[PDB]
Design a protein around this ligand. Structure first.
Ligand SMILES: O=C(N[C@@H]1C[C@H](C(=O)NCc2ccc(C#Cc3ccc(CN4CCOCC4)cc3)cc2)N(C(=O)C2CC2)C1)[C@@H]1C[C@H](F)CN1
Ligand SMILES: [Zn+2]
Length: 297
């Protein structure tokens, strides 16, 4: 059968929080069967643990954020992206501060570390949510859609009215396209104008070229430019995938985002969980017949 994966070994990384400018020490520990992904504030006494279920999501404005009480964990999307990518079911994610470190602006550093350590299969069937019906949300000109699909695939359009905006639509089937190779390296991005305002509202305090695509009026200001033709929309997919990990079970279906953010992605989540008609849980007693598949541990 398809079995749950956890970490083989623990991983320590160090970085800054993009919004906080805070030095943050990160530790990824294996977790038991049926733990799911569980974020943890080790700097607090006692320690505060927020499962990365959708129920725990807060201010979605500048990043995806987990809350319990008046304790938050900011910017989980890139890491959850990475964990989703490699099909990790169970991990604890320890932090010395409120924000998850940004590293380079992509999932790549996270995927690296996860795979250097390696994965452990566990005597327990992986549980899957199969999309069974179109489920759609709109707000103004944004839209966000699940569509049943025998596999896992993500599509995104964006429109920025911008000299730099190269391609603004992409679609990836992850049962025939390497998440690792095609999506994981896609960096977050800010606009020159936004940044000037946000710094003077104590946001983007840890932001630099070393972890973000910086865009002028006209051009990427990053000396070494883009990792991809379509990095921006490739990053949007990355983020989308993270948000979808909050289900707390992997997805057999397709997502389509149009101009969508964390806020509308999270609405889509809630609505989907609410319409029990629209989905079902499935395990597979024979991976050679299952519609999505996995990399070697
Ligand atoms: O990636 C995400 N969203 C995407 C990207 C983008 C967005 O929300 N971006 C959010 C974002 C905002 C600001 C920065 C920065 C910086 C910065 C760079 C240089 C200096 C000065 N330097 C410092 C060093 O010295 C030299 C100068 C100072 C600061 C990076 C990302 N977006 C948008 O739609 C944008 C348009 C609204 C969709 C989510 C959200 C979080 F960003 C993380 N994941
Ligand atoms: Zn992002």
């Amino acid at each position: 059968m398809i079995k749950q994966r956890t970490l083989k070994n623990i991983i320590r990384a160090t970085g800054v929080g993009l919004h906080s400018g805070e030095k943050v020490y990160l530790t990824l520990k294996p977790a038991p069967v049926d733990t799911g992904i569980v974020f943890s504030r080790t700097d607090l006494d006692p320690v505060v643990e927020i499962p990365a279920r959708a129920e725990n999501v807060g201010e979605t404005t500048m990043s995806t954020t987990l809350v319990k009480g008046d304790v938050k964990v900011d910017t989980v999307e890139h890491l959850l992206s990475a964990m989703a990518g490699l099909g990790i079911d169970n991990a604890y994610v320890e932090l010395s501060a409120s924000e998850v470190p940004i590293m380079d602006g992509s999932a790549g550093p996270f995927v690296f570390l996860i795979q250097s350590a390696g994965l452990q299969e566990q005597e327990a069937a992986k549980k899957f949510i199969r999309i069974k019906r179109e489920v759609s949300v709109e707000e103004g000109d944004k839209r966000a859609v699940f569509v049943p699909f025998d596999g896992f695939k993500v599509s995104f359009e964006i429109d920025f009215d911008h000299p730099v905006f190269r391609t603004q639509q992409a679609s990836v089937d992850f049962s025939s396209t390497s998440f690792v190779k095609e999506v994981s390296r896609a960096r977050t991005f800010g606009f020159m104008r936004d940044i000037e305002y946000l710094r003077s509202q104590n946001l983007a305090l840890g932001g630099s070229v070393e972890n973000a695509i910086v865009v002028d009026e006209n051009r990427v200001l990053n000396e070494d430019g883009l990792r991809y033709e379509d990095e921006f929309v490739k990053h949007k997919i990355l983020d989308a995938i993270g948000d979808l990990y909050l289900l707390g079970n992997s997805l057999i279906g397709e997502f389509r985002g149009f101009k969508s953010g964390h806020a509308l992605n999270n609405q889509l989540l809630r609505t989907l969980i609410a319409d029990k008609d629209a989905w079902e849980v499935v395990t597979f007693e024979d991976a050679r017949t299952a519609p999505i598949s996995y990399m070697r541990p």
